[PDB]
Design a protein around this nucleic acid. Structure first.
Ligand code: MET
Ligand SMILES: [K+]
Ligand SMILES: [Mg+2]
Ligand SMILES: [Mg+2]
Ligand SMILES: [Mg+2]
Ligand SMILES: [Mg+2]
Ligand SMILES: [Mg+2]
Ligand SMILES: [Mg+2]
Ligand SMILES: [Mg+2]
Ligand SMILES: [Mg+2]
Ligand SMILES: [Mg+2]
Ligand SMILES: [Mg+2]
Ligand SMILES: [Mg+2]
Ligand SMILES: [Mg+2]
Ligand SMILES: [Mg+2]
Ligand SMILES: [Mg+2]
Ligand SMILES: [Mg+2]
Ligand SMILES: [Mg+2]
Ligand SMILES: [Mg+2]
Ligand SMILES: [Mg+2]
Ligand SMILES: [Mg+2]
Ligand SMILES: [Mg+2]
Ligand SMILES: [Mg+2]
Ligand SMILES: [Mg+2]
Ligand SMILES: [Mg+2]
Ligand SMILES: [Mg+2]
Ligand SMILES: [Mg+2]
Ligand SMILES: [Mg+2]
Ligand SMILES: [Mg+2]
Ligand SMILES: [Mg+2]
Ligand SMILES: [Mg+2]
Ligand SMILES: [Mg+2]
Ligand SMILES: [Mg+2]
Ligand SMILES: [Mg+2]
Ligand SMILES: [Mg+2]
Ligand SMILES: [Mg+2]
Ligand SMILES: [Mg+2]
Ligand SMILES: [Mg+2]
Ligand SMILES: [Mg+2]
Ligand SMILES: [Mg+2]
Ligand SMILES: [Mg+2]
Ligand SMILES: [Mg+2]
Ligand SMILES: [Mg+2]
Ligand SMILES: [Mg+2]
Ligand SMILES: [Mg+2]
Ligand SMILES: [Mg+2]
Ligand SMILES: [Mg+2]
Ligand SMILES: [Mg+2]
Ligand SMILES: [Mg+2]
Ligand SMILES: [Mg+2]
Ligand SMILES: [Mg+2]
Ligand SMILES: [Mg+2]
Ligand SMILES: [Mg+2]
Ligand SMILES: [Mg+2]
Ligand SMILES: [Mg+2]
Ligand SMILES: [Mg+2]
Ligand SMILES: [Mg+2]
Ligand SMILES: [Mg+2]
Ligand SMILES: [Mg+2]
Ligand SMILES: [Mg+2]
Ligand SMILES: [Mg+2]
Ligand SMILES: [Mg+2]
Ligand SMILES: [Mg+2]
Ligand SMILES: [Mg+2]
Ligand SMILES: [Mg+2]
Ligand SMILES: [Mg+2]
Ligand SMILES: [Mg+2]
Ligand SMILES: [Mg+2]
Ligand SMILES: [Mg+2]
Ligand SMILES: [Mg+2]
Ligand SMILES: [Mg+2]
Ligand SMILES: [Mg+2]
Ligand SMILES: [Mg+2]
Ligand SMILES: [Mg+2]
Ligand SMILES: [Mg+2]
Ligand SMILES: [Mg+2]
Ligand SMILES: [Mg+2]
Ligand SMILES: [Mg+2]
Ligand SMILES: [Mg+2]
Ligand SMILES: [Mg+2]
Ligand SMILES: [Mg+2]
Ligand SMILES: [Mg+2]
Ligand SMILES: [Mg+2]
Ligand SMILES: [Mg+2]
Ligand SMILES: [Mg+2]
Lengths: 154, 386
RNA sequence: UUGGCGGAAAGGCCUUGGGUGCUUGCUGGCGAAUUGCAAUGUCAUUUUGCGUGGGGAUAAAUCAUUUGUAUACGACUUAGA
RNA sequence: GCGUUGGAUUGUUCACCCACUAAUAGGGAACGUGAGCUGGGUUUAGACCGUCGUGAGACAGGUUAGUUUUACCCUACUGAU
RNA sequence: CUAUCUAGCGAAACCACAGCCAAGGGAACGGGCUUGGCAGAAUCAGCGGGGAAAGAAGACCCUGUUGAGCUUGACUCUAGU
RNA sequence: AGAACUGGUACGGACAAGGGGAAUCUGACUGUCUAAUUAAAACAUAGCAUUGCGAUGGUCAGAAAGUGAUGUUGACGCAAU
RNA sequence: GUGAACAGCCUCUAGUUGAUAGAAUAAUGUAGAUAAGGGAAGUCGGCAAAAUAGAUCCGUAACUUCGGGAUAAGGAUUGGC
RNA sequence: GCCCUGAAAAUGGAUGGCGCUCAAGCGUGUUACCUAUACUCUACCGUCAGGGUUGAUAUGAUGCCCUGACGAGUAGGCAGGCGUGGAGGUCAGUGACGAAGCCUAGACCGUAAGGUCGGGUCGAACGGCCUCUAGUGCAGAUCUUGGUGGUAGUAGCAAAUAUUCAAAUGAGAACUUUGAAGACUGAAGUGGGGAAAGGUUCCACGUCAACAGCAGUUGGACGUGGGUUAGUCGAUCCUAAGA
RNA sequence: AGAACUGGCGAUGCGGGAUGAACCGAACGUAGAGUUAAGGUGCCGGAAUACACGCUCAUCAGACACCACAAAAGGUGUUAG
RNA sequence: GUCGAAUUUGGGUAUAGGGGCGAAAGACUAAUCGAACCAUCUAGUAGCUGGUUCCUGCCGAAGUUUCCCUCAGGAUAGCAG
RNA sequence: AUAUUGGCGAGAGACCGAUAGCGAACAAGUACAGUGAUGGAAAGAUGAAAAGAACUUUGAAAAGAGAGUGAAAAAGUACGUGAAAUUGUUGAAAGGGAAGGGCAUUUGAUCAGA
């Protein structure tokens, strides 16, 4: 365990994580922030729509010179994308968390994504070859993803 | 050091910024000065540019080399079905300019103009003006009170009119709504004219007449992002130029250490609002009048529409205004024709033009025949027909 | 409550009639203390939330699809029970 | 305010002439402007000549050949959300 | 075919801190200082004015009691003869 | 090689494939070089001329040698210009 | 096969279908083209491009070291049957 | 005297700005007022100087105390101190009931170098004082090594004509396999063999974490194995320039 | 660009000269109060839109030394001799 | 440009650093050439550039004299502790 | 009797404590580079003991969630502690062309002493 800072009830919580996942850390952070706080079923439907290009993931921090689309309007932004790999990883982790909630006996209808955090995994290093016999790094930026879904209560 | 060879600057700095117009309908920013002895009349009209054709007419210009001779001239056709008056707006004057005090709408509005108040008409409940129409419940006391306010105030009176876009061949189906100033005396009678014309059509022949100079206000054809060479007419750089030649070589001196607003830059070309003045009306023709394209010299019973229809527009079925030359905007675009803001007496205006012949050959190619009957007579019998 | 006036940003001004409260215009009766020798010694207006009563109304926009009078992408301009 | 040119020779600035013109005014902006160009000249290395030097070599003397790199950042500007 | 938008992949140069101007004075050409002008989130495509932009401890010039290539009856020597 | 006929007078129908002329400077020519900014008029060249040398020799090597290149050579040669 | 041809172009045997892709079609680019009238006025300079081009027949100047120049220049013809 | 003409330069701009006209301008005179780290008084810190006080409990005579004046500072000198690794002594010092280290807009002491404490983490050593010793204190040196950013999900992954449909496999197919189609190399080949070089890349099976700058079930990848058979082909022998 | 005497800046903060190494004032331990220096007191901006006598009207007024410029020559402008 | 002979080229071989090789450019001699590469002398020397690590307290300068193959340095006296 | 950075065997240190100390605490003159002469690294630490996570569930799988071992998993072989740069989430606050600082106080949060 030892997730990031959470303030929810562990007994009404279910966790899931994936480490050293070879997916863009920036895209995955945007994808996670897109569903942070959402109900679990709503977030899963939204991620499916994103995969289908019906809705977009709004890029808020890692968004310089990316591109503009009308699908960011519902989030009040102009810069949004469809990071399919990040969505696949995040929804696999969401399915795992839903399975863990079911094993714990938690009400699936009351589940919402109470915590989701993506941070940088150690880089996987490759080399690209440059003009005049130069060699530059060609590294990946993989992600550690974690999330916990909790029952909505009062 | 100095420029070393003088040249006029490229482009006009008074048409800045070369940005997209905020609306596809160009605003009328000035109406003719009000003469309050004339009867109440619209100062402008709304039409749709259909296309151009050519005419032949005898030139009346004493002292000219072509006096009493035949000149071929280009003309623009604007499909102008009658506009429906659906409201009146009162304008009071303030130390901060003109200000709309109140607007009084007609009791019944057509679906054409109702669509203008809707982004999604197909899935809406069409509730627009449903409660407003209740102000005409028994005697229209609220409507009369608002009209009384407009009479008591509102040194400027404009009518709200909308096009009958359904009478045009356009697929838009959404009417264009605009304010037209009411010139003529007695703001009280301006309001009376507007109220009496609520829900009623006004034809272009009641606003404009033959030989009249008018102004065309329209958004020009759009061309997207354009380089300096065509956006501003700058000189093409030599073929030897590295990094491209369709550019401006020096976009500024070292000081001021900034690119200046006056330097030609690449950007949006076209889709600009333009008000072009002094276009002479060559015809005020009527759709219900067959032989629209006929003259007293031709007598061939034909409409203004070219063979095969106006290219990308269709057939003219309504009243139409034929103006000399060309006007801003492309075919199918809404244009506003307004009366001239001054009294031009230059023998170019005040010239009475009588068309001898209007071209109705196909504009979809090198049209050879004015009418299908003429094509029949020239070609003889064909295999399919004739 | 009667009526009128006010459009420059009127949102206020004037006025009619009655009801009811106060009146320090004048003359009385009772009360005040202990906040302790002062402590702003809390009296204004500015938004919002929520509850309780009463009145009122019963939409759109965006995405997706479509159009090309538009257009790098956004945007624009069209259509669709 | 508005315009102030087209050319022959010359890398040329300068000059000079032809010609048109209303006029062919003078200048600045890091002697504006090379990640705008070009590279004819000056001003690397090759080579030739003249003069000079014993020589290696010198020459505001002449001649010929001689790689013109990068913007995706910020601002400015042009357009666009 | 790019550029452009998307999926995936994903560097580098550069970086005191940074980034709107006018004038002043100032190491005599400010992004910062002084006085004014002003100044509203987050941005996209271009762009080549500026960042006295980047690239390299100037290669021209001078200094050094720092060299090296080359030349000569410079000084002092030397293989050979 | 020729003749007739034929066609929107097309026809080396795509492909493939010299622009030419009057001159000047310069190097005779073919050839060669600064690989990675100079292909040139620079270098070489045939031709011409000069020089040394008859071998216990000329020219040139080697630290030295009972050592070498020219020389498996001999002036129509070798060596140096 | 065409064609003088191991040229260019198409095909047989054999081999490959490997270069990150999808959507749009702005500017500016890279590569490839066209262009009315004029025809080097552009430019340091015809740079770049265009023009010419194969074959057959005719015709071919100055100059020349008599060998060339020379495809000189300049013309005509070309398919199919 | 004041004012005006004389009095023309380049981004828009400067009595500092606004603005000011019996001035908020100019000349002059009289007051009042504003405020420097200056002056006056006081307190406190330090320094320097001159003194008092071993007459005891009274352990701090380098101490305590009295008096007066003074305090800017680069280069630089000197002095008193703070901190680090190790050493002799001592506190019969701290400590698995938690040493050291580390984190801590929590507290306390010092002018400061720093010191101390609380909390969290942690796991095995460490500290105060008197002295001794030095490889003893970093912001720089285009410093060294390592690590990490903004740039930036950006530049870009655009030469070599070109791919498409279906099925199979597979969790997953633009890229694997089969079939169908469309194309190309067009015999001076994108064909079939070799020399040099490489060294197992050959082939089969399994197999996809990494590599194949997308992908991948595929591979010159990964894991395990199989495979190169000579009297006649070469080397071996000969001599070449030469060693 | 070079000397003389002194005072300064370098090495120096502080108040004033908007701004500035050097000018004016004043040199600096930490604070409190008072008074001042130079400079100021319409507003920025702390402090009299103070008092008093005059002068000046500028279609480029003028507005505090260093200091950020102006001359000869002129004017029934106006003022005083 | 050249393309049948001063042709192109494989392998073998020879020439090795003040040496080679050069149809000659100081060209080439393993991305190194106006003297290759490798190791050592070597931590070469530098009057020249850069950096030079804790606090507080007190005092606190010089750019001047003379001499120097001296003028970016030093000795000397002066200023300072 | 004198010398001895080589070899062999020993005993020591006011030496260094993994960027230090030999280049090499470790399969170091190794991997790797160069035609060659030569050049030449990086790289130590779970825990007392693997007791190295049986079993269940989701997933194609890697892994995740549990369960368990252990004194500790805030020791899971990417392993003692685990700083900084840089980063994610959460919380708080501020934000008209930088930000940061000094004096002074308002406000919010937080806290010592009596
Ligand atoms: C003088 O011209 C100096 N810049 C050096 C010239 S050599 C190209
Ligand atoms: K040299
Ligand atoms: Mg941007
Ligand atoms: Mg881009
Ligand atoms: Mg590359
Ligand atoms: Mg390479
Ligand atoms: Mg000019
Ligand atoms: Mg035009
Ligand atoms: Mg070029
Ligand atoms: Mg047409
Ligand atoms: Mg210049
Ligand atoms: Mg420039
Ligand atoms: Mg340049
Ligand atoms: Mg230039
Ligand atoms: Mg040149
Ligand atoms: Mg030269
Ligand atoms: Mg001579
Ligand atoms: Mg400025
Ligand atoms: Mg200045
Ligand atoms: Mg700057
Ligand atoms: Mg300011
Ligand atoms: Mg650019
Ligand atoms: Mg620039
Ligand atoms: Mg230098
Ligand atoms: Mg140098
Ligand atoms: Mg000297
Ligand atoms: Mg020497
Ligand atoms: Mg030649
Ligand atoms: Mg030949
Ligand atoms: Mg040749
Ligand atoms: Mg070369
Ligand atoms: Mg060349
Ligand atoms: Mg020669
Ligand atoms: Mg043949
Ligand atoms: Mg043409
Ligand atoms: Mg033509
Ligand atoms: Mg011609
Ligand atoms: Mg010319
Ligand atoms: Mg010209
Ligand atoms: Mg010329
Ligand atoms: Mg050419
Ligand atoms: Mg000839
Ligand atoms: Mg010919
Ligand atoms: Mg003042
Ligand atoms: Mg005065
Ligand atoms: Mg004493
Ligand atoms: Mg001091
Ligand atoms: Mg030590
Ligand atoms: Mg501890
Ligand atoms: Mg902290
Ligand atoms: Mg332990
Ligand atoms: Mg040290
Ligand atoms: Mg450091
Ligand atoms: Mg330092
Ligand atoms: Mg550094
Ligand atoms: Mg580094
Ligand atoms: Mg990109
Ligand atoms: Mg590319
Ligand atoms: Mg390709
Ligand atoms: Mg296939
Ligand atoms: Mg081909
Ligand atoms: Mg082919
Ligand atoms: Mg294989
Ligand atoms: Mg890949
Ligand atoms: Mg992959
Ligand atoms: Mg294998
Ligand atoms: Mg044999
Ligand atoms: Mg001087
Ligand atoms: Mg100094
Ligand atoms: Mg001073
Ligand atoms: Mg001043
Ligand atoms: Mg004081
Ligand atoms: Mg004040
Ligand atoms: Mg005078
Ligand atoms: Mg030379
Ligand atoms: Mg040293
Ligand atoms: Mg002192
Ligand atoms: Mg001497
Ligand atoms: Mg110096
Ligand atoms: Mg080591
Ligand atoms: Mg470790
Ligand atoms: Mg522990
Ligand atoms: Mg750890
Ligand atoms: Mg951190
Ligand atoms: Mg902004």
């Amino acid at each position: 365990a030892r997730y990031g800072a959470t303030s929810t009830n562990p007994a009404k919580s279910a966790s899931a994580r994936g480490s050293y996942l070879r997916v863009s850390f920036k895209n995955t952070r945007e994808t996670a922030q897109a569903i942070n706080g959402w109900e679990l079923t709503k977030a899963q439907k939204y991620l499916e729509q994103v995969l289908d290009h019906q809705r977009a993931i709004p890029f808020r921090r890692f968004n310089s010179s990316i591109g503009r689309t009308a699908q960011g309007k519902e989030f009040g932004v102009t810069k949004a994308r469809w990071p399919a790999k990040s969505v696949k990883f995040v929804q696999g982790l969401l399915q795992n968390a839903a399975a863990n909630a079911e094993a714990k006996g938690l009400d699936a209808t009351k589940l919402y994504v109470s915590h989701i955090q993506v941070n940088q995994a150690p880089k996987q290093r490759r080399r690209t070859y440059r003009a005049h016999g130069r060699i530059n790094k060609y590294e990946s930026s993989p992600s550690h993803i974690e999330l916990v879904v909790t029952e909505k209560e009062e | 050091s100095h420029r070393k060879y003088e040249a006029p600057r490229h482009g006009h700095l008074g048409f800045l910024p070369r940005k997209r117009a905020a609306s596809i309908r160009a605003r009328v920013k000035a109406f003719p000065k009000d003469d309050r002895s004339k009867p109440v009349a619209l100062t402008s009209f709304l039409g749709y540019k259909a296309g151009m054709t050519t005419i032949v007419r005898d030139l009346d210009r004493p002292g000219s080399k072509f006096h009493k001779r035949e000149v071929v001239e280009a003309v623009t056709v604007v499909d102008t079905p009658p506009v429906v008056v659906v409201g009146v707006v009162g304008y009071v004057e303030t130390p901060r300019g003109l200000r709309s005090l109140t607007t009084v709408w007609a009791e019944h509005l057509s679906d054409e103009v109702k669509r203008r108040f809707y982004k999604n008409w197909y899935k809406s409940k069409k509730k627009a003006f449903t409660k407003y129409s209740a102000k005409y419940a028994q005697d229209g006391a609220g409507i009369e009170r608002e009209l009384a306010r407009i009479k008591k105030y509102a040194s400027v009176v404009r009518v709200l009119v909308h096009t009958q876009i359904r009478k045009t061949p356009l697929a838009q189906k959404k009417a264009h709504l605009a304010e037209i100033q009411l010139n003529g005396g007695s703001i009280s009678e301006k309001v009376d004219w507007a109220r009496e014309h609520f829900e009623k059509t006004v034809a272009v022949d009641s606003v404009f007449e033959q030989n009249e100079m008018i102004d065309a206000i329209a958004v020009t054809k759009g061309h997207g992002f354009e380089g300096v060479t065509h956006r501003w007419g700058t000189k093409k750089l030599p073929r030897k130029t590295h990094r491209g030649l369709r550019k401006v070589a020096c976009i500024g001196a070292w000081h001021p250490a900034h690119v200046m607003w006056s330097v030609a830059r690449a950007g949006q070309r076209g889709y600009h609002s333009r008000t072009s003045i002094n276009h002479k009306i060559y015809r005020v023709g009527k759709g219900d009048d067959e032989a629209n394209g006929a003259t007293s010299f031709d007598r061939t019973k034909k409409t203004i529409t070219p063979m095969g229809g106006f290219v990308h527009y269709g057939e003219i079925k309504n009243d139409f205004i034929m103006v000399k030359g060309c006007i801003p905007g492309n075919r199918k675009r809404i244009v506003t024709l307004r009366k001239s803001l001054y009294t031009n007496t230059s023998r170019k205006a005040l010239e009475e033009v009588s068309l001898k012949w209007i071209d109705t050959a196909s504009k979809f190619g090198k049209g050879r025949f004015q009418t299908p009957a003429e094509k029949h007579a020239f070609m003889g019998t064909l295999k399919k027909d004739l």
